[PDB]
Symmetry: D2
Subunit: 397 residues, 4 copies
């Protein structure tokens, strides 16, 4: 087992094994490779032979044997990145769009910041652009919390309070539907009702801690943060959200014993939660891997929740452009005012693209143009065929 892997590569210099290991798409910093890397650096305290290789690499031989036997979703990851970087450059030449300026903190960002980050369901990573820069998830948070609320409360309870449909264009300026419930969890009125359902007993700060760690697990312990800067400005300008909270209260859209102003405070807080492109890309891959975090192998979300989330991101995720997005891209995604697009390609990869300038609908101009180009090249559409995709390309093989 460790033995065949050895011959697959006299003896072996360290750099030779690390260069080939990186080619697969894995990063040496992978939590599943910690033992392999510790022993590898310990032996450099005391180039290696057969039984030595067997000593360092056996700790997680399974993952390493499958990585070198090309048993990942994308086998040739080095060509995939060449295609990703190609599309990144194509989208880059589009300087149109407007950066949101409705609060001072979103207006701070430069229009030239363009980042795209990939994380696959088998652990591989790729990045290009301004990916190490933090921004607030804003509305990208909506699926993340609905996935959480359904996890603890089941799909039936959550939908006593919220709907499962896209309202359209008109009727979508309406807070509630015929039955006095928000149309779906992906609109402001819906997210607030969703937000009220989590950790109903305890106080706000605990709920935040409860959610903040949930995102920590969905991201494989990468960067999640909080911008009190944006939180303050969001909390002192959302007059329209206060209109919603009062109509929800008037129509009894909350669980009994809910403090409406307490929920709205929590609502603003969650929108001010920070990520980078890379930290979020692992989250999207946790949605792409049935609830399991790719880079850690841990189990964070229930299959019932993950499914529903992708189902609603499909229909009502990308604002009013969802219909043309579900038609041409055929991938579940979520849009944010900071310019983030949280994309999920099921059984393949997770993804997060970012560019502050928004269009008439409120979506990342460079991100939409990129998402479209991603499907024009690869057979990733929801209703593409794995046998007959004509002039397309299948990176899974």
């Amino acid at each position: 087992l460790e033995d065949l892997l050895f011959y697959t590569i006299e003896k072996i210099p360290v750099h030779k094994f690390i260069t080939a290991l990186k080619s697969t798409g894995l990063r040496t910093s992978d939590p599943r490779l910690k033992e392999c890397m510790d022993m590898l650096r310990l032996t450099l305290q005391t180039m290696l032979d057969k039984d030595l290789f067997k000593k360092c690499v056996q700790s997680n031989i399974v993952l390493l044997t499958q990585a070198f036997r090309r048993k990942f979703v994308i086998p040739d990851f080095m060509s995939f990145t060449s295609h990703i970087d190609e599309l990144y450059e194509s989208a880059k030449k589009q300087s149109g769009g407007k950066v949101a300026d409705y609060i001072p903190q979103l207006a701070k960002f430069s229009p030239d910041l363009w980042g795209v980050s990939v994380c696959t369901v088998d652990g591989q990573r790729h990045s290009i652009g301004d990916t190490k820069v933090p921004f607030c998830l804003q509305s990208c948070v909506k699926p993340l919390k609905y996935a959480i609320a359904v996890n603890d409360l089941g799909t039936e309870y959550v939908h006593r309070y919220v709907g499962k449909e896209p309202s359209g264009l008109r009727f979508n300026k309406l807070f509630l539907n015929e039955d006095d419930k928000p149309h779906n969890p992906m609109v402001n009125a819906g997210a607030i009702v969703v937000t009220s359902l989590i950790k109903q007993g305890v106080n706000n700060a605990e709920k935040f801690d409860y959610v903040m760690q949930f995102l920590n697990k969905m991201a494989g312990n990468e960067y999640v943060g909080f911008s009190n800067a944006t939180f303050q400005s969001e909390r002192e300008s959302g007059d329209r959200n206060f209109a919603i909270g009062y109509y929800l209260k008037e129509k009894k859209c909350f669980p009994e014993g809910t403090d409406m102003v307490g929920i709205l405070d929590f609502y603003f807080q969650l929108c001010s939660i920070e990520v980078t492109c890379e930290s979020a890309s692992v989250m999207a891959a946790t949605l792409a891997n049935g609830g399991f975090c790719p880079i850690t192998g841990e189990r964070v979300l229930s299959p019932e929740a993950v499914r529903n989330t992708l189902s609603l991101m499909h229909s009502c995720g990308m604002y009013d452009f969802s219909g043309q997005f579900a038609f041409h891209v055929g991938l579940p995604a979520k849009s944010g005012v900071a310019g983030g697009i949280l994309l999920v390609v099921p059984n393949v990869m997770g993804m997060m693209c970012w560019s502050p300038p928004l269009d008439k609908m409120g979506n990342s101009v460079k991100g939409i143009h990129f998402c479209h180009d991603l499907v024009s090249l690869c057979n990733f559409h929801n209703y593409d065929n794995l046998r007959h995709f004509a002039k397309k390309l299948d990176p899974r093989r």
Copy 2:
């Protein structure tokens, strides 16, 4: 290639016939034409070369079957489940049969059948699956796929939209752009209808569609009912209202006979099928434009892709939304009680029961469509690695 196949079983002809049907195939399968013809000549036993002589022209599809390499290898277990689902829905006598015309009102409320056809041509059937019934509104995706295949997505959508109107609205004939909301509704399919074979006339236009529909079915039963055509034509005032509001707003192509298109529309709705010939029709859409049982390219994967996308969002009337959330599979409901369901990269189905619900959908059929997803991981957003407590028939 053949000798090994022979070693894997002298041979009694029927013990080979048993093992072939043990794959979910029919001996009638057109891709086995040479074998069955060459077999039928030699006639109660076979040797190495006599076998070799009979299976050489079908060796690929024949090796592919016995080597457990079909989309659903264990196919006998799969049909035990399908039948268990079938019997459970068979116990739901609820609903009302469409009475607005006698043709739809004749049919017994207890008729009920479902047939499947995989992307590899594997077949199953249970119930009244050979009784002819009109597609009615299960035709809308077929001609839309026909339309996109011939004209392309760009031309077709200068005239029709790509989105679900909502709930109300959809009472409205046209959206804010003076275009029908989508081709899955009457106002939409009419404009779509007036795109197909623009040059010729109704007799030729109807001949062209039936060719295409013959292709989608591997030449299984596709017919027409004049009794339904006349009545529907007589009692379709609302469709006349649409046609006149379409002509007023200039929704049709240049030089169009909106009256002549309506008759074409009514004809296209009265096309008869069985649960079996429809099961292949849906399987073609599950196979990227390839009729599984024949192997011919019928539609472009472009038209197939858009067609599935619209059944998913717009296909089940008002229940389309709760369908995508719970079933997560592209389908189409017609007034006759038929549901054109598709499981991409896997199989296609047609479930038929005359009694409809308030939404206008088959009661036993939707019951079946839910149960199928609770049992197996066929939901569009299920995961092929961790699907918890469901069944994966793909293995």
Copy 3:
């Protein structure tokens, strides 16, 4: 009685002093209520002077109406000064050359007592179109009743869009002043007969309404609607699916009788009496004949107020406060209850579908006079009150 009036107008009267004095009252000699007086007067000219005896011989028959005329007991007593204002308003509209014809301009006046004024192109014929919508609704109510008519139609304005709907929530058309409702109210008149007797019957009503002044028909504009009726045929077919028509109705035939009714011709002058019949509780001012019922007349004016000027109705009712109906040919049917009726005809329309010169005239008229629905009669600030 006649002796009093005699030197209301010396020992003798010149025959042309009498006619010139009664013309000032606003009446015409053509007035059906002055036939005997004018007839006997011509016979007397065959034997130019009038004494106490033959003046009495001539005016004895129509003395009552002739007294109210000279007692200045008519609704607009000083009429000559009012028509002086009507002209000043006329010339103002004229200066506005805006509008889109789907140049002529004239406005005619008929009070509830039969006084007349007309300035501009008041004798040129034109198509009624939607201006006939109030006329046939009143005929329906007069013959059927309000409970029958509104078992099929409603009495409600709709909204900006919902206006784009054929039916309200009850599977009824919104009001009788939109195409959908007018088609239904057209299916109510003269049911057992056919379009020949249906048309002739409705035409019979319109003639009495206008005091047998010009009512006619156009075939050119008829053949035009027949071809352009795609929208009315869409409305008609959706009307069948919801069974809004009375039973035994052939709407393909109702649609043809419909375009006929929109093709009816009037002048500003005959229309003025047709609308003055609505201002006078159902009695024609120039004939004194009862044409419609108060039930028909009241209902009609109501729907003309809230639903009469297309979408502009709300805007109209706030700055004008008058019941009215507009036509695509460019004529507006204006009504001032208890006072008068009018017709303003200028073919070019504005964006909302109303004649630009008409809406201007209506605004100026109300600006000047307290004819508004909720203007007060005791304190009207700076406005004029032609009632004195």
Copy 4:
């Protein structure tokens, strides 16, 4: 003149004949004449009658010559009383039951009152025309209608807060009355704003009963989630005039709904709208005709909630209903009115008043598009 009325006297005989006119001795226009009969006490010849009625002879003549808008008043009130007792027997409805009163004040100061017309109730929604007539009089038509529309809505278009112009639909919807409240007395504070509105409501009523209930004021402050929701959407859209504290405007808004009136003072209020801005019992100029005309217009098409269409059709009278059970009825150039009964219907209008507004016009030709010459069997109290 005074001599003319003299032949046309014991004291009890002058004051009794006066009461037949519908006038009352409390009348602010008859004070000085009544002060004189106070002096003669502790039978009137020419000289003494001429001394008493000296001051207000012009009004008293108009009374004793049937010059008033309704000449045979006691005959008209006998019908009002009949319509009152007929409407009284209808007991259906729900209250937000045993109380029911109607009160009449003509544009000539004639008074008639029957029922529970002494009990104070809150105006509530009925204050919206009053509120709006003030602002148009104080600001103008062009300014006020830059912040609020002047059109009806529809059954579910009123589910919306704003139109496509991002203005409220009219001054008769809560969204519109919230904006109008922010148009009055912007310079001062909520305490001086309220006092100002109160003084205006006193002239309209001819110094009769106007009040305030703190009990209902607090009760509106607790429940106003829907008004809070509207108020916050109006702020997001920048609908208010600049420098507006919105959450205090709402407080003011609640205060105006909790203002107390009685059927009798409210009758004079509607009569000020029927007399063109003049108070019938005082003859003072309260509101400009522009404000009065605009108000009666919007009381016709927007006055009775959703029921305006059938109300403007069947009744043809400008009205305004409220949740306490009050309908402000206005008959132009004739009378002003107030009916009051707690139980309302599914439309929110008083079952007894609705019954009364229908029957009134069914009997009297008060409909806006009735004819003064030809009205079939309906009554004309003016002749």
